[PDB]
């Protein structure tokens, strides 16, 4: 069987940040895959101020066994001090994908 | 105080960002990512659309999930606009304590 | 009003990527499909990092077609074992949720 897997969603400031990042967790073995969607803005309050700022979205793929050490690893590398790390569960996927996904880890 | 990520999308970046702003100012989500140069394609009165899109991923915790729904459905020029909830399941604790602390 | 769910399918290019949603569309799979080009797909291949510009796709449907919408997309997938991954959706605009569910 497979272990239950996430996508894990994580903001980077630019490309060469969200590369760096990627291929860390990716050595580490503690993702399987990362989609870098580059492009993007984020808006939010910091500190009572506004904030619009360029971000390149962040989207890896790991099991549940490895969230843990995936969040910590990229928050450590992660030059933002409190930057986005969130979980969200796949409850369903294909199967052969899966087993990659479990046999890359 | 569990947290979600709630999906939306708006015709282009400007009413994207006023969408964000808005919601973001009405402290019922603490975050909004944006993300233009999509395209959306689904039937409408018979025919297959394709639509250029912005993509939108807000931050926001259960208790404020609904609030934030009918606030951006409000502001949304479009009566019946993607808005869906997916739970998230886990997250870095100083980034939910974060998010937390943003919302009303 | 059967519960709903996204699904995340990788396509090499554009226009891959809109056949593929066309699709799944005609099929009644999915009600509807957003996709973002431009995306870059970093893994570990063969021992070496591979480096893929893609597009990420993002579908709409319900439990009830999940299983028959992944087997759609991987069998008009050019690829041998994309990327198929469901997530669930906990709560949605009641409105949007009935029109998703009715274009099924």
């Keep these: 069987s ?10 980077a400031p630019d490309e060469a940040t969200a590369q760096d990042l990627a291929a860390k967790v990716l050595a580490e073995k503690l993702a399987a895959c990362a989609t870098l969607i580059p492009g993007a803005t ?3 309050y910091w500190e ?3 904030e619009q700022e360029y971000e390149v979205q962040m989207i890896l793929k790991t ?9 910590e690893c990229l928050k450590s590398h992660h ?7 969130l979980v969200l569960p796949v409850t369903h996927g294909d199967t052969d994908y899966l087993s990659w996904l479990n046999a890359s880890l």
């Design 79 to 85: 030059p933002y001090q409190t930057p986005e790390l």
């Design 2 to 11: 497979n272990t239950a897997s996430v996508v894990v969603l994580c903001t």
């Design 42 to 44: 984020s808006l939010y």
């Design 63 to 71: 099991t549940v066994s490895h969230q843990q050490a995936l969040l």
């Design 48 to 50: 009572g101020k506004l």
